[model samples]
Target: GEVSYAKERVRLITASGRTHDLTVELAVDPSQREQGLMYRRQMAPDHGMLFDFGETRPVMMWMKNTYLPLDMLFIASDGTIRTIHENAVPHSEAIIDSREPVAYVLELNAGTVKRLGVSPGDRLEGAGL
Candidate 1:
């Protein structure tokens, strides 16, 4: 049987005052977070994955075997964007650190940050927060 992921419709309010809506899969369990978006070569333009860390803690991520370039948003428990790491290189083993404690991490296709003008302090809404 294929693994089924929980889904959510999320929104981001950018610093530029634009709102973007996206469909995302919820990665709440350790297994799901471990697998992440690895092995995926393509993702819908408005689709992403949200990884909930369960508590506020510094998070470290690596592209590893992941095939798609992504922009990772380190989000606080209140849904605030704490840090933005853009255009993570595919298949690289470099660690991307959140640097500070955060409750969630949202991964979107590369360039989405620049294209949407998303910045630190942007609000992430509809993430079940």
Candidate 2:
């Protein structure tokens, strides 16, 4: 099931030993998952797109036909960050693997991973996840 435009304040503990919260969009449906941030031209610094896979499994992502550069976060079923792919080439078909099974994926503006100091082993807290 999908939420009805419920905006959540999600907290993430960064690798820098600091924490920050982001107001993000939730993508829970198959159509929403398939067409994630495809045509958007701009996104605020504190905003992001979060995709729920419904189950834990390794997932692959590509920037094919996407017009904006993004940073992808792979989150495990237990809400721990497993991997991050930063500054992905726009419209690139190159496969971005999660490297491990994950239940959620978060996409944000390019460089967010670095700016927020997010990294593997960090925790993600949100009701939606």
Candidate 3:
């Protein structure tokens, strides 16, 4: 049997009062896991995309044809902002880490982290990932 998953749209408000609109695509299958955030032109200032691993673990991200720089936020299932990688350039194969265990990874526009005062240990609401 074929299983279908639901995609949800969510908005995350940081501690500095900046909001990020994102499309939450649950990584429930192998194919979805393989094809993550690739070939995207640009992500809106207040918008991003998320990948959920269902459980906490060390997560990594890279900018492959991503076009725009991004600030990757590694979040734990408990909503703790594990770590952050700021201003990752487009098409760069840089390894961004949580430096700890995490279940959710949020990718936002470059400089968004510093601009919104987002850092490790900060709590994120609407935990879709």
Candidate 4:
């Protein structure tokens, strides 16, 4: 009776070398990647989603109809944050490019980047990605 999503135990490490844990819904395939929290307005601070591109590739994203501002973490295959797009405007078509090949992406609530002091060098760890 419900649409199923792949999920994981994801963790983000800040610049100060602390781990922040999250329960993340995963999008390993195309359809889910495009859907991408588009209609979701209610995300708990401790929960978010990770989009697994499967391998390092150039990626571009837009908020489109996503209802909440999100902090996008462009991740390399080895779990390092390659680039971070913070506080992406909701319902906007402005594109956010990875600027280089990246293997994974993690989306967190708006302002999380500044609050957590996340940087391009910060690391991430998780399962099923």
Estimate, for each residue in 1-129, the C-alpha lDDT of model 4 and write its tens digit.
676687788888887878888888988899889888989979988788888887889998889889999999999998999998888999989999998999988999998878877788988887643
Tens digits of per-residue lDDT for model 3 on 49-125? 56777677787777765777778878778667777878888888776767678888777778877877766777666
Q: How far is candidate 2 from the true structure (C-alpha RMSD, Å)?
A: 2.8
Candidate 3 residue 4 C-alpha distance from true site, Å: 11
Candidate 1 lDDT (Cα, whole model)?
A: 0.93
Best by lDDT: 1
- In model 1, residue pairs whose N, Cα or C atoms come closer than 3 Å (at least 3 residues apart or on different chains), thus clashing, are none
RMSD for each model, in Å, please?
0.9, 2.8, 3.7, 1.3
Candidate 2 lDDT score at position 129: 48
Q: Evaluate all candidate structures by whole-model CA lDDT and list the values in order.
A: 0.93, 0.85, 0.69, 0.87
Estimated TM-score for each candidate:
0.96, 0.89, 0.75, 0.94
Q: Candidate 1: which stretches are off by over 4 Å?
A: none
